[PDB]
Structures are given as structure tokens and as C-alpha cells.
């Protein structure tokens, strides 16, 4: 029953092709939530989560971080594109900011109540957007390979942070994770780390099955628990 | 509204003075939850949490771990009493098992659905009780100084574990917490760690006010968030 529509946004050097979802039957301004997808691109997994957020009463924008709606399917083809973003965090943040712009342009979005969630690379994207100083009230990352802190970002995260983490995730090792947590603690960010034992990468995606590589596996419990923790953080900051 | 009654229990060595709290508006067998208090003794803070569990539909037993209902207020005498349990974990576990016995003796308790929570030393007590092999479906610790693992306990934890942890807690430092998590991971315990940035010991007790010592401070958010996580875990295992 959720109103679902394509949205093209961004400045023309290849436009982003995303999805906007909201509960048509609700009225007035509502919180908006960005959904940043896994590295491959905007897939049904990300769109379905945007639909769940709409059912929770939010205006959700499932973002395209590649341009043109491109969804990679091999790591050899994906590798150039993702390494380019890792090496150019200014461009990476600009792409995320373009999604925020498009969300803020919706008539139904409360500009003072905007948050972001992200899966894998999308969770890293949320943190990059927050580090740029964007006015996110909250952000939640799910099995994300978070990037190292940069001095120039000190003090720029104004929202709350929830990191949902598989304790055995090989793409977010303890030393790198502790360095991120030390940035957040230094700047007195309200952060929470929810770590799951026996859980690794991609734990929210049912397509991460036994055919996948070691360290990439769906976990139904972690999926449900992390979603519940995100729902509780949003209830907090959107009250 | 909650039915609240003193209960004296034990099997010889000492006689414990606890509180049994339940919603007597509900019929049939109900899940039971042990509440182990802070090191001082069975105080109002612990009884109040047992009351809240009763309101959730559980039969709650707020445990006395010293005997006689004694509540210490001087560190010069409480210290030795706690360290004596630290050095005799068999005795420590027997006192916790006496509480479990008294909970299971209630006509209204579903002995297939029993859990335990604890604050500070009480959270350490929950983990000792589970390591003994007690049939706890779940346990949740709140700012607990958990004790190091014993090989004899390998594989004896049959329930789910949620550890709610102030990242700055001086009584539970990273190296020692990692050793506990290594035990749980080795035995494939379904465990979760919920860590709070900028939060330390005693974060659930408002009595840990500004007059206290460093590293002991109430945090309203961590209090609410950890309680909500515990609620979600019990909703899981008691379904």
C-alpha cells in the first residue's frame, strides 16, 4: 500500500536513479530516512528496507551511489568503481549529499528530522555523510566497513550513531573499528556499538548464502535485532 | 498494582531475604526472571526493576546474595565480602542457584522459561550462574564486571547472552571483556554486546549521581536503551 516512485536526482554528469517511498495515507511533514545500499548498487534489498521505513511512517529515499542506477554483479567490474570512491572521499560524500538534497526536496519531509541507514558500503557512506557535517539526527550502519577517521572531520558529527556489527566481520577488523570509536568518543558523539557473536558480514541480506565467500553470511537474529535497535534510535530522535 | 511479597529462601548455610513480584492479574504459568542486585545488596533499585519485569508479565525474584537482607554501605566491609565470593566461585554460584531454586519453586513459574538480569556484581552473578550450567533461557548484564572464564565451564551456557556495557567502565576493561567474549564465541553462545560511548559503570542507577566517584555515573539514555534491548531479548526467548 506504500506509495513508491522512481526519483532522478543529481547534477547531470550522470544522474542518480533512486526510489522514493512513503505512506500515502499519512499527512503532514514526516521524518525522512536515506537508505544507502551495498556496494554492488541499489537493489531490491535496499528498496524493501525503504518500504519498511515508509510503513513506520517515514519518507524513505533509496539512494543510487553509482549513477544511472547501475548495479554491478562481479567484483572485477565493481572494483574500479568502489576503489575510486574509497580514494576520493570528497566525491563519495558529494554523491551522498546529492541523495540528502533530493530527500530534503520532498514536500512531506521534516527538514529537522532526517536520518540515514546503510548496508555494507552504504553504512560506510552514512558515516562519511555525517563526517562531512550533514544535519543527520541519527545514522545506523549494518555490517559496514567504516573508513578511518580524518582530522579535518573532528567535531562534525552532530547526530546519534548506532553501529550494528558482526563480531567476526573480516571487512571491519578490531583495530580499525576501535579507531573509529575513538574519533566518536573524542568528539563526545552519542554512539552505540551492537556487536553480534558468531556473525560476520552481510548479515542482513538473505542472498548471502552458503555459496558465498567465508565471512559473508545472513543471520536472521542479527538482522531482526539490528533493525529493532535502529527503530528504537529513530523513535528516540524523531520524538 | 503488582503483587509484592518477601520471600526467605536457602538450604542451610545462610538464609536469604528476597522479594517476589508478579502481576497476579495474569493466569497460568509465566516466565520467571531473577534480578541480582548491585554489590551493596538487595536495594530499592533492584526491587524496582523486578517490579517493572512483573509489569511485563514475568514472575520476578529480586535476590539477596549476602544473606539476611543485609545492605552494605561501607567499602571497608563490603570489599572483603565481594572479594570472598570472587575467590570462591563455587560458593558464589551456590548462592545464585538458591535464588533460582526459589524462583522455580513458585507455582506460577514456567520452569522452561527462566532468565536472569543483574546490575554490576549482579550481572557478574548472572554469568556465573549460567556458566554453572543452570537452565537460563537468557541473561542480561548491565555494567557488570564479568569474571574471567574457567575451562571447566566450557559449553555449559545453554541460553542467550546480552551484555550491556559502558565503553568507559573502569571495572570491565577491553582485554578482560574480550576474554569473556572469546569463551562465548568458542562455545557458539548466541551473544550480543551493546556498548555505549561515553558511558561508564552504574549507568542504570540514578543514585550514581554527581556526588559519586569517577567512572560511576547514571546515563538516562544507556539505561533506557539497555532495558529495551533486554525486553527484546526476553520477548524472543519467551515467545
Coordinates of C-alpha atoms in Angstrom, one line a residue:
Chain A
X1 CA 0.0 0.0 0.0
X2 CA 3.1 2.2 0.2
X3 CA 3.4 4.9 -2.5
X4 CA 6.6 4.0 -4.4
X5 CA 8.1 6.1 -7.2
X6 CA 11.4 6.5 -9.1
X7 CA 13.3 9.7 -8.5
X8 CA 16.1 11.0 -10.7
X9 CA 18.4 13.5 -8.9
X10 CA 21.9 14.9 -9.2
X11 CA 23.5 17.5 -11.4
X12 CA 23.7 15.8 -14.8
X13 CA 27.2 14.3 -15.1
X14 CA 25.2 11.0 -15.0
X15 CA 22.1 11.4 -12.8
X16 CA 21.3 9.2 -9.9
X17 CA 18.3 6.8 -10.2
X18 CA 16.7 6.2 -6.8
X19 CA 13.4 5.2 -5.2
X20 CA 11.1 7.3 -3.0
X21 CA 8.7 5.5 -0.8
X22 CA 6.1 6.9 1.7
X23 CA 2.8 6.0 3.4
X24 CA 0.3 8.0 1.2
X25 CA -2.3 7.7 3.9
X26 CA -0.3 9.8 6.4
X27 CA -0.4 13.6 6.3
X28 CA 1.8 16.4 7.4
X29 CA 5.6 16.6 7.4
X30 CA 7.3 13.4 8.5
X31 CA 10.9 12.3 9.2
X32 CA 12.9 11.3 6.2
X33 CA 15.4 8.4 6.1
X34 CA 18.1 7.8 3.5
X35 CA 18.8 4.2 2.6
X36 CA 22.3 3.7 1.2
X37 CA 22.7 0.2 -0.5
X38 CA 25.5 -2.3 -0.6
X39 CA 28.5 -1.7 -2.9
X40 CA 27.0 -3.5 -5.9
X41 CA 24.3 -0.9 -6.2
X42 CA 20.7 -0.1 -5.5
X43 CA 19.0 -3.5 -5.3
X44 CA 15.7 -4.9 -4.0
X45 CA 17.2 -5.4 -0.6
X46 CA 17.7 -1.7 -0.1
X47 CA 14.3 -0.8 -1.7
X48 CA 12.5 -3.3 0.6
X49 CA 14.1 -1.6 3.7
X50 CA 12.9 1.8 2.4
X51 CA 9.4 0.3 2.1
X52 CA 9.6 -0.9 5.7
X53 CA 10.7 2.6 6.8
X54 CA 7.7 4.0 5.0
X55 CA 5.4 1.7 6.9
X56 CA 7.0 3.0 10.0
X57 CA 5.7 6.5 9.0
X58 CA 8.9 7.9 7.4
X59 CA 9.7 9.3 3.9
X60 CA 12.4 7.0 2.6
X61 CA 14.8 7.6 -0.3
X62 CA 16.7 4.5 -1.5
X63 CA 19.9 6.2 -3.0
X64 CA 21.9 5.4 -6.0
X65 CA 25.6 5.9 -5.3
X66 CA 26.9 4.9 -8.7
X67 CA 24.8 6.9 -11.2
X68 CA 22.4 5.8 -13.8
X69 CA 21.0 3.1 -11.5
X70 CA 24.0 0.9 -12.3
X71 CA 24.1 -2.4 -10.3
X72 CA 27.3 -4.3 -10.6
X73 CA 27.4 -8.0 -10.2
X74 CA 31.1 -9.0 -10.4
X75 CA 33.8 -7.8 -8.2
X76 CA 36.2 -7.3 -11.2
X77 CA 33.7 -4.8 -12.7
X78 CA 32.9 -3.3 -9.3
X79 CA 36.5 -2.9 -8.2
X80 CA 37.5 0.2 -10.1
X81 CA 34.3 2.0 -9.1
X82 CA 34.4 1.2 -5.4
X83 CA 38.2 1.9 -5.2
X84 CA 37.6 5.2 -6.9
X85 CA 35.2 6.2 -4.1
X86 CA 37.4 5.0 -1.3
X87 CA 40.3 7.1 -2.8
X88 CA 38.1 10.2 -3.2
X89 CA 36.1 10.7 -0.1
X90 CA 35.1 14.2 -1.2
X91 CA 33.4 12.8 -4.3
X92 CA 31.9 10.0 -2.2
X93 CA 30.4 12.5 0.2
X94 CA 29.1 14.6 -2.6
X95 CA 27.2 11.7 -4.0
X96 CA 25.7 11.0 -0.6
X97 CA 24.9 14.7 -0.2
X98 CA 23.0 14.7 -3.5
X99 CA 20.7 12.0 -2.1
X100 CA 20.2 14.1 1.0
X101 CA 19.3 17.1 -1.2
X102 CA 16.8 15.0 -3.1
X103 CA 15.2 13.8 0.2
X104 CA 15.1 17.3 1.7
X105 CA 13.3 18.5 -1.5
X106 CA 10.3 16.4 -0.8
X107 CA 7.3 18.4 0.4
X108 CA 6.5 15.8 3.1
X109 CA 10.0 15.7 4.6
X110 CA 10.6 17.4 8.0
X111 CA 14.0 19.0 7.4
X112 CA 14.8 18.9 11.2
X113 CA 14.2 15.1 11.4
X114 CA 16.4 13.3 8.8
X115 CA 18.4 10.2 9.4
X116 CA 20.4 7.7 7.3
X117 CA 20.9 3.9 7.2
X118 CA 23.3 1.9 5.2
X119 CA 24.3 -1.7 4.5
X120 CA 27.9 -2.6 3.9
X121 CA 29.4 0.2 1.8
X122 CA 26.1 2.1 2.3
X123 CA 26.8 2.1 6.1
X124 CA 30.3 3.4 5.4
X125 CA 28.5 6.0 3.2
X126 CA 26.3 7.1 6.1
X127 CA 29.3 7.8 8.3
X128 CA 31.1 9.7 5.5
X129 CA 28.0 11.9 5.1
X130 CA 27.8 12.6 8.8
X131 CA 31.6 13.3 9.0
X132 CA 31.0 16.0 6.3
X133 CA 28.8 17.8 8.8
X134 CA 25.5 17.0 7.2
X135 CA 22.5 17.5 9.6
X136 CA 21.6 13.9 10.2
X137 CA 19.8 13.4 13.5
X138 CA 20.9 9.8 13.6
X139 CA 22.6 7.2 11.5
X140 CA 22.7 3.4 11.6
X141 CA 25.2 1.2 9.9
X142 CA 24.7 -2.5 9.3
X143 CA 27.8 -4.7 8.8
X144 CA 29.7 -1.7 7.3
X145 CA 33.4 -1.4 6.5
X146 CA 33.8 2.0 8.1
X147 CA 36.6 4.2 6.8
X148 CA 39.4 5.6 9.0
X149 CA 38.9 9.0 10.8
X150 CA 40.3 12.2 9.3
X151 CA 41.4 15.1 11.4
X152 CA 39.5 17.6 9.2
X153 CA 36.2 15.9 10.3
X154 CA 36.7 16.5 14.0
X155 CA 33.5 17.5 15.8
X156 CA 31.3 17.5 12.6
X157 CA 29.0 14.6 13.6
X158 CA 26.0 16.2 15.3
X159 CA 23.7 13.2 15.3
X160 CA 23.5 9.9 17.2
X161 CA 25.3 6.9 15.9
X162 CA 24.5 3.2 16.0
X163 CA 26.9 0.7 14.5
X164 CA 25.5 -2.9 14.1
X165 CA 28.5 -5.2 13.7
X166 CA 29.2 -8.8 13.2
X167 CA 31.9 -9.7 15.7
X168 CA 33.6 -11.9 13.0
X169 CA 33.2 -9.5 10.1
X170 CA 36.5 -9.6 8.2
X171 CA 35.9 -6.3 6.5
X172 CA 35.7 -4.3 9.8
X173 CA 38.7 -5.5 11.9
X174 CA 39.1 -4.6 15.6
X175 CA 41.9 -2.1 15.3
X176 CA 40.2 -0.1 12.5
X177 CA 36.9 -0.2 14.4
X178 CA 38.5 1.0 17.6
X179 CA 40.0 3.9 15.8
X180 CA 36.6 5.0 14.5
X181 CA 35.1 4.6 18.0
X182 CA 38.0 6.7 19.4
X183 CA 37.1 9.5 17.0
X184 CA 33.4 9.4 18.1
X185 CA 34.4 9.2 21.8
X186 CA 36.9 12.1 21.4
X187 CA 34.1 14.3 19.9
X188 CA 31.6 13.2 22.5
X189 CA 29.3 11.6 19.9
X190 CA 26.4 9.6 21.4
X191 CA 27.4 6.3 19.8
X192 CA 26.4 2.7 20.4
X193 CA 28.0 -0.4 19.1
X194 CA 25.8 -3.5 18.9
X195 CA 28.1 -6.5 18.2
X196 CA 26.8 -10.0 17.4
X197 CA 28.7 -13.1 18.3
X198 CA 29.1 -15.7 15.6
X199 CA 28.0 -13.2 13.0
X200 CA 30.0 -11.7 10.1
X201 CA 29.5 -9.6 7.0
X202 CA 26.2 -9.1 5.1
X203 CA 24.1 -10.5 8.0
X204 CA 21.0 -8.5 6.8
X205 CA 21.0 -9.9 3.3
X206 CA 19.3 -13.3 2.7
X207 CA 21.2 -13.6 -0.6
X208 CA 24.5 -14.1 1.4
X209 CA 24.0 -17.8 1.4
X210 CA 26.3 -20.8 1.7
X211 CA 27.5 -20.3 -1.8
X212 CA 29.2 -17.1 -0.8
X213 CA 32.7 -16.5 0.5
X214 CA 33.8 -17.2 4.1
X215 CA 32.8 -14.3 6.4
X216 CA 29.7 -13.3 4.4
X217 CA 26.5 -14.9 5.8
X218 CA 23.0 -13.9 6.5
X219 CA 21.9 -14.1 10.2
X220 CA 18.2 -13.9 10.9
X221 CA 18.6 -13.0 14.5
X222 CA 21.2 -10.2 14.0
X223 CA 19.0 -8.9 11.1
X224 CA 15.9 -8.6 13.3
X225 CA 17.8 -7.3 16.4
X226 CA 19.7 -4.6 14.5
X227 CA 16.5 -3.4 12.8
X228 CA 14.8 -3.2 16.2
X229 CA 17.7 -1.2 17.6
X230 CA 17.5 1.1 14.6
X231 CA 13.8 1.5 15.0
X232 CA 14.4 2.4 18.7
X233 CA 17.0 5.0 17.9
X234 CA 14.7 6.6 15.3
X235 CA 11.8 6.7 17.8
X236 CA 14.1 8.5 20.2
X237 CA 15.4 11.2 17.8
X238 CA 12.1 11.7 16.0
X239 CA 10.0 12.2 19.1
Chain B
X1 CA -0.8 -2.9 41.2
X2 CA 2.0 -5.5 41.2
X3 CA 1.8 -8.2 44.0
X4 CA 4.9 -7.9 46.1
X5 CA 6.0 -10.2 48.9
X6 CA 9.0 -11.0 51.0
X7 CA 10.5 -14.5 50.4
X8 CA 13.0 -16.2 52.6
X9 CA 14.9 -19.0 51.0
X10 CA 18.0 -21.1 51.1
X11 CA 19.0 -24.7 52.0
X12 CA 21.1 -24.3 55.2
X13 CA 24.3 -22.3 55.1
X14 CA 22.7 -18.8 55.0
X15 CA 19.1 -17.6 54.8
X16 CA 18.4 -15.1 52.1
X17 CA 15.7 -12.3 52.3
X18 CA 14.4 -11.5 48.8
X19 CA 11.3 -10.1 47.1
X20 CA 8.9 -11.9 44.9
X21 CA 7.0 -9.7 42.5
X22 CA 4.3 -10.7 39.9
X23 CA 1.2 -9.4 38.2
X24 CA -1.5 -11.5 39.8
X25 CA -4.0 -10.4 37.2
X26 CA -2.4 -12.9 34.7
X27 CA -3.3 -16.6 34.7
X28 CA -1.2 -19.7 34.1
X29 CA 2.5 -20.3 34.2
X30 CA 4.6 -17.3 33.3
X31 CA 8.3 -16.8 32.5
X32 CA 10.5 -16.2 35.6
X33 CA 13.3 -13.7 35.9
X34 CA 16.0 -13.4 38.6
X35 CA 17.1 -9.9 39.5
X36 CA 20.6 -9.9 41.1
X37 CA 21.4 -6.5 42.7
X38 CA 24.5 -4.4 42.9
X39 CA 27.3 -5.4 45.3
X40 CA 25.9 -3.3 48.2
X41 CA 22.9 -5.7 48.5
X42 CA 19.2 -6.0 47.6
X43 CA 18.2 -2.4 47.4
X44 CA 15.2 -0.4 46.1
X45 CA 16.9 -0.1 42.7
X46 CA 16.8 -3.8 42.2
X47 CA 13.3 -4.3 43.6
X48 CA 12.0 -1.6 41.3
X49 CA 13.5 -3.4 38.3
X50 CA 11.8 -6.6 39.5
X51 CA 8.5 -4.6 39.6
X52 CA 9.0 -3.5 36.0
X53 CA 9.5 -7.1 35.0
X54 CA 6.3 -8.1 36.7
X55 CA 4.5 -5.4 34.8
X56 CA 6.0 -7.0 31.6
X57 CA 4.2 -10.2 32.6
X58 CA 7.0 -12.1 34.3
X59 CA 7.4 -13.6 37.8
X60 CA 10.4 -11.7 39.2
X61 CA 12.6 -12.7 42.2
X62 CA 14.9 -10.0 43.5
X63 CA 17.7 -12.0 45.0
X64 CA 19.7 -11.5 48.2
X65 CA 23.3 -12.5 47.6
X66 CA 24.7 -11.7 51.1
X67 CA 22.1 -13.4 53.4
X68 CA 19.8 -11.7 55.9
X69 CA 18.8 -9.0 53.5
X70 CA 22.0 -7.1 54.5
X71 CA 22.8 -4.0 52.5
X72 CA 26.3 -2.7 53.0
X73 CA 27.3 1.0 52.7
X74 CA 31.0 0.9 53.8
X75 CA 33.6 -0.2 51.3
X76 CA 35.9 -1.3 54.1
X77 CA 33.4 -4.2 54.9
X78 CA 31.7 -4.7 51.5
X79 CA 35.0 -5.1 49.7
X80 CA 36.0 -8.2 51.6
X81 CA 32.6 -9.8 51.3
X82 CA 32.6 -9.4 47.5
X83 CA 36.3 -10.5 47.1
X84 CA 35.4 -13.5 49.2
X85 CA 32.8 -14.5 46.6
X86 CA 35.3 -13.7 43.8
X87 CA 37.7 -16.1 45.3
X88 CA 35.2 -18.9 45.9
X89 CA 33.1 -19.1 42.7
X90 CA 31.5 -22.4 43.9
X91 CA 30.0 -20.6 46.9
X92 CA 29.1 -17.6 44.7
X93 CA 27.2 -19.9 42.3
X94 CA 25.5 -21.8 45.1
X95 CA 24.0 -18.6 46.4
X96 CA 22.8 -17.7 42.9
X97 CA 21.4 -21.2 42.5
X98 CA 19.5 -20.9 45.8
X99 CA 17.7 -17.9 44.2
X100 CA 17.0 -19.9 41.0
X101 CA 15.6 -22.7 43.2
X102 CA 13.3 -20.3 45.0
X103 CA 12.1 -18.9 41.7
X104 CA 11.4 -22.3 40.2
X105 CA 9.5 -23.2 43.4
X106 CA 6.8 -20.7 42.6
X107 CA 3.6 -22.3 41.3
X108 CA 3.3 -19.6 38.6
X109 CA 6.7 -20.1 37.0
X110 CA 7.2 -21.8 33.7
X111 CA 10.4 -23.7 34.5
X112 CA 11.1 -24.0 30.8
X113 CA 11.2 -20.1 30.5
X114 CA 13.6 -18.7 33.1
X115 CA 16.0 -15.8 32.6
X116 CA 18.2 -13.6 34.8
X117 CA 19.3 -10.0 34.9
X118 CA 21.9 -8.3 37.1
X119 CA 23.5 -4.9 37.7
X120 CA 27.2 -4.6 38.4
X121 CA 28.1 -7.6 40.7
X122 CA 24.6 -8.9 40.0
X123 CA 25.4 -9.1 36.3
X124 CA 28.6 -10.9 37.0
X125 CA 26.4 -13.2 39.2
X126 CA 24.1 -13.9 36.2
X127 CA 27.1 -15.1 34.1
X128 CA 28.4 -17.3 36.9
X129 CA 25.0 -18.9 37.3
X130 CA 24.9 -19.6 33.5
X131 CA 28.5 -20.9 33.4
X132 CA 27.4 -23.4 36.1
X133 CA 25.0 -24.9 33.6
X134 CA 21.8 -23.5 35.1
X135 CA 18.9 -23.7 32.6
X136 CA 18.6 -20.0 31.9
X137 CA 17.0 -19.2 28.6
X138 CA 18.6 -15.8 28.6
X139 CA 20.6 -13.5 30.7
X140 CA 21.3 -9.7 30.5
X141 CA 24.1 -8.0 32.4
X142 CA 24.1 -4.2 33.0
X143 CA 27.5 -2.5 33.6
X144 CA 28.9 -5.7 35.1
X145 CA 32.5 -6.6 36.0
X146 CA 32.4 -10.1 34.5
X147 CA 34.8 -12.6 35.9
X148 CA 37.4 -14.5 33.8
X149 CA 36.4 -17.8 32.2
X150 CA 37.1 -21.2 33.7
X151 CA 37.8 -24.1 31.3
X152 CA 35.6 -26.4 33.4
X153 CA 32.6 -24.2 32.4
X154 CA 33.2 -24.8 28.6
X155 CA 29.9 -25.3 26.7
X156 CA 27.7 -25.1 29.8
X157 CA 25.9 -21.9 28.8
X158 CA 22.7 -23.0 27.1
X159 CA 21.0 -19.6 26.8
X160 CA 21.3 -16.3 25.0
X161 CA 23.5 -13.6 26.4
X162 CA 23.2 -9.8 26.2
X163 CA 26.0 -7.7 27.8
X164 CA 25.2 -4.0 28.2
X165 CA 28.4 -2.2 28.7
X166 CA 29.6 1.3 29.3
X167 CA 32.6 1.8 27.0
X168 CA 34.4 3.8 29.7
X169 CA 33.6 1.4 32.5
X170 CA 36.8 1.0 34.6
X171 CA 35.6 -2.3 36.2
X172 CA 35.3 -4.0 32.8
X173 CA 38.3 -3.2 30.6
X174 CA 38.7 -4.3 27.0
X175 CA 41.3 -7.1 27.4
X176 CA 39.2 -8.8 30.1
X177 CA 35.9 -8.3 28.3
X178 CA 37.5 -9.8 25.1
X179 CA 38.4 -12.9 27.1
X180 CA 34.8 -13.4 28.2
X181 CA 33.6 -12.9 24.6
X182 CA 36.3 -15.4 23.4
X183 CA 34.8 -18.0 25.7
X184 CA 31.3 -17.3 24.5
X185 CA 32.4 -17.4 20.8
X186 CA 34.4 -20.6 21.3
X187 CA 31.3 -22.3 22.6
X188 CA 28.9 -20.8 20.0
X189 CA 26.9 -18.9 22.5
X190 CA 24.4 -16.6 20.9
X191 CA 25.8 -13.4 22.5
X192 CA 25.4 -9.7 22.0
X193 CA 27.4 -6.8 23.3
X194 CA 25.7 -3.4 23.4
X195 CA 28.4 -0.8 24.1
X196 CA 27.7 2.8 24.9
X197 CA 30.1 5.6 24.1
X198 CA 30.8 8.0 26.9
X199 CA 29.1 5.8 29.5
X200 CA 30.7 4.1 32.5
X201 CA 29.8 1.9 35.5
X202 CA 26.4 2.1 37.3
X203 CA 24.6 3.7 34.4
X204 CA 21.2 2.2 35.4
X205 CA 21.2 3.6 38.9
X206 CA 20.1 7.3 39.3
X207 CA 21.7 7.1 42.8
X208 CA 25.1 7.1 40.9
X209 CA 24.7 10.9 40.9
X210 CA 27.2 13.8 40.8
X211 CA 28.3 13.1 44.3
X212 CA 29.9 9.7 43.3
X213 CA 33.3 8.6 42.3
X214 CA 34.8 8.8 38.7
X215 CA 33.7 6.1 36.3
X216 CA 30.3 5.6 38.2
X217 CA 27.6 7.7 36.6
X218 CA 24.0 7.4 35.6
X219 CA 23.1 7.7 31.9
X220 CA 19.4 8.0 31.2
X221 CA 19.9 7.0 27.5
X222 CA 22.0 4.0 28.2
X223 CA 19.5 3.0 31.0
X224 CA 16.5 3.2 28.6
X225 CA 18.3 1.6 25.6
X226 CA 19.8 -1.3 27.6
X227 CA 16.4 -2.0 29.2
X228 CA 14.7 -2.0 25.7
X229 CA 17.3 -4.4 24.4
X230 CA 16.7 -6.7 27.4
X231 CA 13.0 -6.5 26.8
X232 CA 13.5 -7.5 23.1
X233 CA 15.7 -10.5 24.1
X234 CA 13.1 -11.8 26.6
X235 CA 10.3 -11.3 24.0
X236 CA 12.5 -13.5 21.8
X237 CA 13.2 -16.4 24.1
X238 CA 9.8 -16.3 25.9
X239 CA 7.7 -16.4 22.6

